[PDB]
Structure formats: C-alpha cells, structure tokens
Amino acid sequence: GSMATVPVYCVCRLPYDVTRFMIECDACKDWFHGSCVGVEEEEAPDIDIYHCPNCEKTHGKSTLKKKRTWH
Amino acid sequence: ARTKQT
Ligand SMILES: [Cl-]
Ligand SMILES: [Mg+2]
Ligand SMILES: [Mg+2]
Ligand SMILES: [Zn+2]
Ligand SMILES: [Zn+2]
Incomplete structure (x- = not known):
C-alpha cells in the first residue's frame, strides 16, 4: 500500500520517471538520467560501454x- | 549501452 518501498536510481536518488531518458552504467548497474550525467538521448545509441562519472575513476571512460x- | 527511452 502507501508504505511500500520504491526503487531509486542515479546520482539524484530519485524513483523512476518514464518521461526522462536514462542510461545504465555497465559497471555498477545503476541507471542515470542523461540530464544528471551529461548524456543526450540522441547521443546514447553511439555509446557502447557506459560508465557513470563515479565508475569512470576506476573502470575507465565510456566507449x-x-x-x-542503419535501418 | 542499455537505455530507457522517452
Ligand atoms: Cl563496436
Ligand atoms: Mg530531462
Ligand atoms: Mg546498433
Ligand atoms: Zn538523476
Ligand atoms: Zn557506475
């Protein structure tokens, strides 16, 4: 009911909002709002391995x- | 990468 828990994500620690684009960090498996981590929805199809700003430091930059x- | 579209 009203006291149920809800998953939270990203650096902002918010629950999911279907109106906002998100990308998964391949390392920590958390999800990140493009607007929170500087990734545009239209640029994401070119990202192979995404690493969030925290995971970058030890797991390397996104590829x-x-x-x-095409098609 | 895995994504959630709008
Ligand atoms: Cl490739
Ligand atoms: Mg947004
Ligand atoms: Mg492709
Ligand atoms: Zn966020
Ligand atoms: Zn991460």
Whole structure:
C-alpha cells in the first residue's frame, strides 16, 4: 500500500520517471538520467560501454560503438 | 549501452 518501498536510481536518488531518458552504467548497474550525467538521448545509441562519472575513476571512460545498424 | 527511452 502507501508504505511500500520504491526503487531509486542515479546520482539524484530519485524513483523512476518514464518521461526522462536514462542510461545504465555497465559497471555498477545503476541507471542515470542523461540530464544528471551529461548524456543526450540522441547521443546514447553511439555509446557502447557506459560508465557513470563515479565508475569512470576506476573502470575507465565510456566507449563508443565502432559500427552501427542503419535501418 | 542499455537505455530507457522517452
Ligand atoms: Cl563496436
Ligand atoms: Mg530531462
Ligand atoms: Mg546498433
Ligand atoms: Zn538523476
Ligand atoms: Zn557506475
């Protein structure tokens, strides 16, 4: 009921909002609002391995896809 | 990457 827990995500620690774009960090498996971590929805299809700003420090920077599906 | 679209 009203006292149920809800999952929270991102650096902002908010529950999910379907109107906002999010990307998963491949390392910590948390999810991040593009607006919170500087990733545009339209740029994300080019990201291969996404690492959040915290995970970057030990797991390395995000990588880009070397090939893409057109169509 | 895995994403959640709008
Ligand atoms: Cl690739
Ligand atoms: Mg937004
Ligand atoms: Mg593709
Ligand atoms: Zn956020
Ligand atoms: Zn992370």
